[PDB]
Ligand binder design. Sequence first.
Ligand SMILES: NCCCCCC(=O)NCCCCCC(=O)O
Ligand SMILES: NCCCCCC(=O)NCCCCCC(=O)O
Lengths: 384, 384
Amino acid sequence: STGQHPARYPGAAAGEPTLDSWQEPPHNRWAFAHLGEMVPSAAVSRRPGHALVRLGAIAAQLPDLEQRLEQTYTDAFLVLRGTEVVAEYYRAGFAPDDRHLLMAVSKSLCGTVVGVLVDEGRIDPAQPVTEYVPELAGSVYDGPSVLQVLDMQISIDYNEDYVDPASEVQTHGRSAGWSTRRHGDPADTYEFLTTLRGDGSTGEFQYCSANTDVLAWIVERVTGLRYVEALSTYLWAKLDADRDATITVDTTGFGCAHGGVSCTARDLARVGRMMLDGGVAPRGRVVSEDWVRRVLAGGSHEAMTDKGFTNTFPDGSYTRQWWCTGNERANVSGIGIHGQNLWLDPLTDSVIVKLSSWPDPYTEHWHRLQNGILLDVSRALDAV
Amino acid sequence: STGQHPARYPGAAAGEPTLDSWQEPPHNRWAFAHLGEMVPSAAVSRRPGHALVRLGAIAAQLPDLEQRLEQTYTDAFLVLRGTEVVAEYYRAGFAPDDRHLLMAVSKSLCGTVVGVLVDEGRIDPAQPVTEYVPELAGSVYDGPSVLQVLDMQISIDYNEDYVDPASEVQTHGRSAGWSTRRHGDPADTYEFLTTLRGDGSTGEFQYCSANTDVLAWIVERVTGLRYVEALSTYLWAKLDADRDATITVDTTGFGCAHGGVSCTARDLARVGRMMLDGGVAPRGRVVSEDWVRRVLAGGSHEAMTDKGFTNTFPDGSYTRQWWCTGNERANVSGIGIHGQNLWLDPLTDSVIVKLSSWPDPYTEHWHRLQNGILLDVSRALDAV
Ligand SMILES: NCCCCCC(=O)NCCCCCC(=O)O
Ligand SMILES: NCCCCCC(=O)NCCCCCC(=O)O
């Protein structure tokens, strides 16, 4: 068993409703107001073919930028310098206020929610995961600290290969409802997480999407809120965002913390703005100055042995669900496959959002091009 | 085979993407911007316990109205007199701008889209369904006219029993993605519709949700648009609505025309306002004066043999996806199970929206109470 989880609605039985029960009482009072959480659904637009190009005062320094964005399958691109939007691009067919899947940029949002609860003293990063989720006893998460989950420093038998059909990340996806279930698959994400094993070693970076969903599980046990609600209460609702975000949910209503958030480019930039404002958002403080400082400082360099990342960023690292380049600008970024970045450039007090759809989840080729653009744009923002 | 259908995106292969392919190119450029159409998803609120009660100047005439609304499991209630909102109620936990499933009030929206295309001469109601959807040859829809589909005057072996697990409406639901698929089930709604049979007789009213999805299929073949887009272009985008509507979609992206639309109470009222404005919406004409006149006039009384409806409304009838009471006020209503009404009161130039979640889909008990409220409210709007 995976223990207590936040009910889908007040008074709901465990795991209710399902796809087969949402029409029945008492579930239907909730379900009729939230049907998209149960059944795939399309928007019917209240509004009645060409790219929107407003690259502003970086266009002069980067004359070929639009072509570079097209070449990296850019859907939305936005540069926020201070509080001002100084450059924007949206491909034909993608509206400025359309939402876009964040993939693992989602992780950086989850880490932020954890940070809030650390500030409140409700989570102690030094404590074992099992202090908050006892039911992970006997799994690879039995022993490691919450900080080691935050920093992805746990050795896990989990192949995070995004193309291999046999990998654990595929099984993770089926458990999350991202793909069709196979016979024998875990019922939900919680169950899937309890199946994970490892050799027991910690301290070396291993990127694993399971870690983030463990963090969200911790958030749920500490707050009693569905992760979907926690993400709103502790982060999204404080941003004064233009639109709601969305997040995929599995059959229990558990939001896919590791990869399933969608939002507008402009609203994602508000998260970066909060980070560069020492953790304060328009409607109140989100996380502490100390938490932000620790994110910007980076993780242990020794732990970071991922040659892909370090080939580009020799002094790079990872902490608290953020990638830290350790470059001369000390850039830090949320990163998702197929070209998603929430990129922070503290030197110029700027945030760059790039949301894309590369044909491949991740290759050195796309990595090189994507980071080349983000660095060139950052530098174009420097005083001259 | 069910023939040509509108592609999910420009250039998409038939039936693509599926739950198992949306992450792959070329699908992912579209899917990353529309993931809720593939995977169940929750809203993450941008906004940070008690009912909202603003019953205005009908409260005096109906002092017990709030209790009557509670007793009929009312989630949202709104009265529009002319252009003015004169009464509103929303239950605790349901916000004024929350969306609510319409169930078969959805049908009246679909009929409106058909009406637009009849006005344009792109659909001739006198023509057989097969003039527009040849692939329905050999089915119960081989022979009947489009008008007979609009008026639900086709005898079909289809048990529209909302509680019986064995009924065709359940199989319809599985084909639409509302419930878990069983082995042997049709792949999608189009395929399901082609399996339907009947004795060949027409002319007598038989309420059947399959009819509305046939109408949406016709709309798609005539316009080349996904029904989701047709519903927006021909209706929703002309209303100047506060919010997008949503509609559930099956595995091909086909919107559930018969039951799957959700929207706010205030926005649904804009549809009624359009009907009482002779078919004109704020952003342009939706349907012709003649179409609206024919809806308000009612269908053939002889055809209406449903004792449930006629027990309450002896002179009642059905036409063009609207229920017509034939009462002394000539009230006409869209109706959905569990207590959804888009109720028109032309006498007072008023629209009443009631969106509910009765524990039962439909019983004489709820029917009596619901119609009692709508009639009392209508009468309270009369000059005195
Ligand atoms: N199919 C599920 C996908 C879950 C999201 C995974 C994701 O976005 N991962 C980001 C990996 C970035 C790697 C950065 C680097 O190695 O340089
Ligand atoms: N489980 C799928 C439900 C599809 C919607 C059906 C629906 O809303 N039907 C309305 C029936 C109204 C009957 C009115 C009357 O008989 O008085």
